[PDB]
Amino acid sequence: VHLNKTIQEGDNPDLTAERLTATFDTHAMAAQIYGGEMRARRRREITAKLAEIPELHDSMPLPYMTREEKIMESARKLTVLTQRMSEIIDPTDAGELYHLNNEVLGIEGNPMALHGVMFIPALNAQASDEQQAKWLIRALRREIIGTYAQTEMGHGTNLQNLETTATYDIGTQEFVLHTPKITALKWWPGNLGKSSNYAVVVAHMYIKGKNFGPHTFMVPLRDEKTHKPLPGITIGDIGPKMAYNIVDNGFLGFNNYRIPRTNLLMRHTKVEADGTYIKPPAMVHVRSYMLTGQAIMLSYALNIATRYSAVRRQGQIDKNEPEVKVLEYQTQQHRLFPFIARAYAFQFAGAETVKLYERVLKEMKSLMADLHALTSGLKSVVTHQTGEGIEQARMACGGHGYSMASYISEIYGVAIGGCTYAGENMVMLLQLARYLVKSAALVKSGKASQLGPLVAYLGARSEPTSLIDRVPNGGITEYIKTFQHIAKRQTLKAANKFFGLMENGEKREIAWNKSSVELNRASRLHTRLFIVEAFARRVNEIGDITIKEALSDLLHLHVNYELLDVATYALEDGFMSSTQLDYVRDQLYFYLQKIRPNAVSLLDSWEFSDRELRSVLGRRDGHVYENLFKWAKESPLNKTDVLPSVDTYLKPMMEKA
Amino acid sequence: VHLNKTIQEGDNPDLTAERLTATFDTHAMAAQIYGGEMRARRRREITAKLAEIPELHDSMPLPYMTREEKIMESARKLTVLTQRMSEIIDPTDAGELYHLNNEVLGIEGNPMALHGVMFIPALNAQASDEQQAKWLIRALRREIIGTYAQTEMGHGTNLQNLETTATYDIGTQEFVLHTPKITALKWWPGNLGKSSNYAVVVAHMYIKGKNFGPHTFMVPLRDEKTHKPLPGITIGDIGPKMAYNIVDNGFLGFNNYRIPRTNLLMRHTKVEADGTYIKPPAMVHVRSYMLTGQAIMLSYALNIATRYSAVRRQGQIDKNEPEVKVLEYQTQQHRLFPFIARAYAFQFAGAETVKLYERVLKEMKSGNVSLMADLHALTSGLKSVVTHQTGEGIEQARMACGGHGYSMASYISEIYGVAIGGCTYAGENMVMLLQLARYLVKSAALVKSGKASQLGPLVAYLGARSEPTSLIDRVPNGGITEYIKTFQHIAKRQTLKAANKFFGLMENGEKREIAWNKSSVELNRASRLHTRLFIVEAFARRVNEIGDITIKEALSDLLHLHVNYELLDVATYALEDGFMSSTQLDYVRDQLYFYLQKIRPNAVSLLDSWEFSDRELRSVLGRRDGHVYENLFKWAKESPLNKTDVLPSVDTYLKPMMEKA
Ligand SMILES: Cc1cc2nc3c(=O)[nH]c(=O)nc-3n(C[C@H](O)[C@H](O)[C@H](O)COP(=O)(O)OP(=O)(O)OC[C@H]3O[C@@H](n4cnc5c(N)ncnc54)[C@H](O)[C@@H]3O)c2cc1C
Ligand SMILES: Cc1cc2nc3c(=O)[nH]c(=O)nc-3n(C[C@H](O)[C@H](O)[C@H](O)COP(=O)(O)OP(=O)(O)OC[C@H]3O[C@@H](n4cnc5c(N)ncnc54)[C@H](O)[C@@H]3O)c2cc1C
Ligand SMILES: Nc1ncnc2c1ncn2[C@@H]1O[C@H](COP(=O)(O)OP(=O)(O)OP(=O)(O)O)[C@@H](O)[C@H]1O
Ligand SMILES: Nc1ncnc2c1ncn2[C@@H]1O[C@H](COP(=O)(O)OP(=O)(O)OP(=O)(O)O)[C@@H](O)[C@H]1O
Ligand SMILES: [Mg+2]
Ligand SMILES: [Mg+2]
């Protein structure tokens, strides 16, 4: 058997050659990627089981379809999926369901996408025990379809200025929902337009004229039998989008729509029947769990671009040798491999974040602040660097990347949306910047010892100079220490600019605005430091020497590519020299060439079947050209030879001349 | 009147407020953008004329349509367009045709997009006088539909290894075109799949077994009356794409398809009837003229993002004042305004490039191809930097609209998909940057060997001597020259540094081409800096040509924002050798944030100065009048998925699924 477990007989030999050079077992790397040998094996067992159920396969290639056709296809697969789920899956294994959906439903959306991502989690986090019994069970059994309705046409970021109102009628004992203007329409909740018949709905709660602020409510939207909008409801789709068009993102409006008092979600907060209010002592779920989604989507795109790079030949290096694999050019390795490093790094960073999400929550029955800040920065950097890498992966396929035969353009449209959902990236970076400024005030005021673990480096003292290419035994610790220095220096520098403008008389919020770009520079460096450290932490946890060396090579590529990308900050104070920067450059180009024989195996280790990956250029077997010709020939515009546009128009136009 | 000529009564006052602060006449800035007052006025006159012809309007909003519906809509407008063109336009000055097409046909494509972009230019540049009479006239009159077929399924970059063959039969006096394998299929030529009935076709020419390399041929593809494929022709669409889906990009295959000898394009090469060859003494057209296309598409996206930023309120700065325009936050100004600077810079750089394209070509009747090399290298780098930085900016503009930007009501996502395609067409960006790098390495060998005086004007700075230190924030001068000199220093230093690494590996024994590959990433760093320097210098040159003081000050503010944003983005190269200090870099930072706030009251006018009507711009968020929310609610309500209340997906599937539980 081969160390690379994806080789099959008959595969394109140009691609097999790249798998044959693997130094590690791809099953063992999968276990690392997916958090356990068991987890990885279940992925493969699910994939092998779905191969025997053709009902759950793409009835035709998805890029052939109109929006209407895709929505029908998705619901077709979903009904079959919900019926047969237990034959394939442990429904309670949130991990198995995610993979099952990726193979069967894919990334473009489905009618119950929000049902899982937010509707159920909102019920877990905010409904009382009695209410969970009424609604959460019906949701889990898929008796109803639900979503989470927070954003409105005129507000998504702010929320203290939402316009939908829930006014408590003390007699009758109902909440009266009302949408006073068009801008108060709920707007963007996924699966709200056509699919959901219930929603959790954020609205400003009014009692005795007093505004208690945003609160969440269970709201029936459509009749459970005919699916018509209940009286007082205005509801529909918000139209087509950049991507993710299978989800029916919706608008929702209320004309004095009454719900029971008990529709207010009361695990935290109560409104008694007379009107009395009792105060208690997320959205954070989405940010914590979306990081794998981005890593995975980045890995989709790199699997395709790197596989295609092994089969695509183009140009000569040596004039007496044949055309080389484009994978041969340093320019091509340089535009792919740093992103393979990033995809592993994002995965490992996401595992630590999910652990921290579970660690708070557990402790919540003084660390939510640290989690909110980490997640704020990480969601913004990961999403932005993923987009950069996906698009580099598309363009690395040449002309054909622009075709939907690559599928990378759809991977891009869906992944990039995470720059805006779950918190605008600019806003989430400034959210982290507030935490970093608080931390900088601790340092400046002598309370350095009160810094939490994630931000203690801001209190540490820097050595004069950075010991890259100095201390014997080139270690990743001198790179970590260099990242720490530049992130601390920019954090304290940006903070002090802010403090200095207030000291000089400017209002807090105007000084904040004037320093906000600088402050986002700090957030970004602090977060990019976190990704490095998480990557290095995993490399050191591993005992299997072949796996450890493979990921260690990747880590070395990571720290040199990233440090070079931020070299400006290392040079400003002379922390780094010209000579150390040329060392980082030569190291970057060295580790490109080191990684190459493993590049395809490092991506095969994610173990995406063709039915998941949906790419012709990225076919597991490497037989691109023949299947690309078929895919073109079978596409909808080639049904007829001479188009209606040519008969109706165009031919008459030519005749007239 | 108002200095800003786009204000109309009834407009959203949040947006009007931003136009009222203009310091210059937007008609006068249009003249600067489009190269003359007359040209700019014609744009507006064309727009006013098209308002009286509703037949040429989007029959319904384009994002509502399937691919099939859009293609039908495009040909509908095209037929009307070709019949009524003379009523609106001077067909020969075009130019006006480019703008007419932008309003009527838009960016997503049309059946005759490549008819203009490449088919006709190929006939101008490569057909003899006799052949132009046969084919170019029919093309201009739109008697035929044509395209340019170079790329194949297996080769786009490496033309030397194309697989389609044209073998000369000496008897019969024909060329025999043949497609020996699937990978030899022509693949990607726009409008080839369904619309064109003729094409210019690049193929390796064989005579008596000898391969003379790529040559271009006029090739009839479909019957002029039935539009069926002529015998021996395999032809169709290559399928849907990231964007630009109205163009039917095609595949084309030949089974020993014979064309006359005289179908070889013979303005420069000849093949006589017996077989005799005779050697002569582009694609460069596309690269030269596509730069405005990118500038314009960048300006579309910024018009939308900045207009929407004036009407979108969100959050408080001062806690006792109402929610602010998002166009107030420094992060928002920082994510838009540098790209406004870039869009002007690309336009001005594109005008100088088109002048150089005309200046060679003009000189190519005499000697005199000793300037094609300078043009090819400039165009190689510029097409790569402009296209890549445009994409960065378009996407920043989309995300500056928040959630709604992701909707097609913004239209920026389509602007993005179409514009970014230019990172790959007309030369892969990585390949075109290395094409420039060859020219820079040749130039570095002149310097190293003492022939500095032989450097052409565009690359003479590589021979100049640098001062010790860069005089930004040191020495007053009337603005910008110390920034230019700093850009020159870092671009020269990286060029000579990357070149010497290449020379050093050969000196140590590596083969030329392996040393090249090993230095290629570094070499593209040089290309990029040299090109980004050119854009600065072109921008500064235009600022100094202008006499109208208000216009000059407005563009001067933009130029200052440009040089500080770009220099900061490349600061690594300025700091490495101590050319710049920490303190000068903090000056560049403070300058960047200053010029953001300086530019703001002009931001919306600088974009209105491009003078894109709503029918051109196609954005709900970007409406000239600023009435976003009401027209966004309508746009959603009228979209195709809201025709019915309960979807078929709910009746067929989904409702049964719920019942079963
Ligand atoms: C929207 C779009 C429209 C198009 N329209 C037309 C048309 O109308 N007519 C026509 O003929 N073609 C058309 N094309 C095709 C286009 O010309 C080619 O796709 C383009 O030239 C890229 O070449 P390629 O496809 O062979 O990419 P490839 O060369 O196959 O792959 C490029 C990758 O390999 C690398 N690479 C390749 N060669 C080298 C080298 N020497 N050195 C270093 N790296 C290298 C690059 O780094 C890049 O990452 C279109 C393409 C697109 C996307
Ligand atoms: C694919 C997609 C899916 C979505 N799914 C859901 C869903 O499922 N459920 C749901 O409830 N909502 C959903 N939304 C809406 C989403 O939550 C909001 O769009 C997102 O949170 C951003 O808020 P916004 O639209 O108001 O951005 P805006 O505030 O309108 O941003 C516009 C510009 O203003 C900037 N800006 C805003 N505030 C500040 C500030 N204080 N300081 C500096 N700059 C600022 C922003 O950085 C941005 O550049 C979705 C949106 C998208 C695109
Ligand atoms: N003109 C371009 N078109 C497409 N992609 C590009 C272009 N220039 C750079 N890239 C990509 O951006 C990534 C960064 O490469 P590189 O660091 O050499 O360029 P840069 O960061 O833009 O310049 P520098 O790092 O020298 O400031 C690479 O993946 C490269 O492929
Ligand atoms: N996390 C992010 N998500 C989306 N866009 C971003 C993000 N960070 C930066 N940008 C965009 O990149 C552009 C450049 O700004 P900036 O220089 O602050 O970012 P950067 O270059 O990545 O950071 P630095 O300059 O410190 O390396 C800005 O216009 C901004 O909109
Ligand atoms: Mg870089
Ligand atoms: Mg920057």
Report on the structure:
2 copies of one chain form a homodimer. In chain A, strands 1, 2, 3, 5, 6 and 9 form a 6-stranded mixed β-sheet that branches. Chain A folds into 4 domains: 25-145, Acyl-CoA dehydrogenase/oxidase, N-terminal domain (Butyryl-Coa Dehydrogenase, subunit A, domain 1, Orthogonal Bundle), CATH 1.10.540; 146-281, Butyryl-CoA Dehydrogenase, subunit A, domain 2 (Beta Barrel), CATH 2.40.110; 282-447, Butyryl-CoA Dehydrogenase, subunit A, domain 3; 476-607, Butyryl-CoA Dehydrogenase, subunit A, domain 3 (Up-down Bundle). Chain A is of the alpha+beta class. Chain A is 53% helix and 8% strand. Chains A and B meet through helix 4, helix 9, helix 10, helix 11 and helix 12 of A and helix 4, helix 9, helix 10, helix 11 and helix 12 of B. The complex binds flavin-adenine dinucleotide (2 copies), adenosine-5'-triphosphate (2 copies) and magnesium ion (2 copies). The PDB classes it as oxidoreductase.
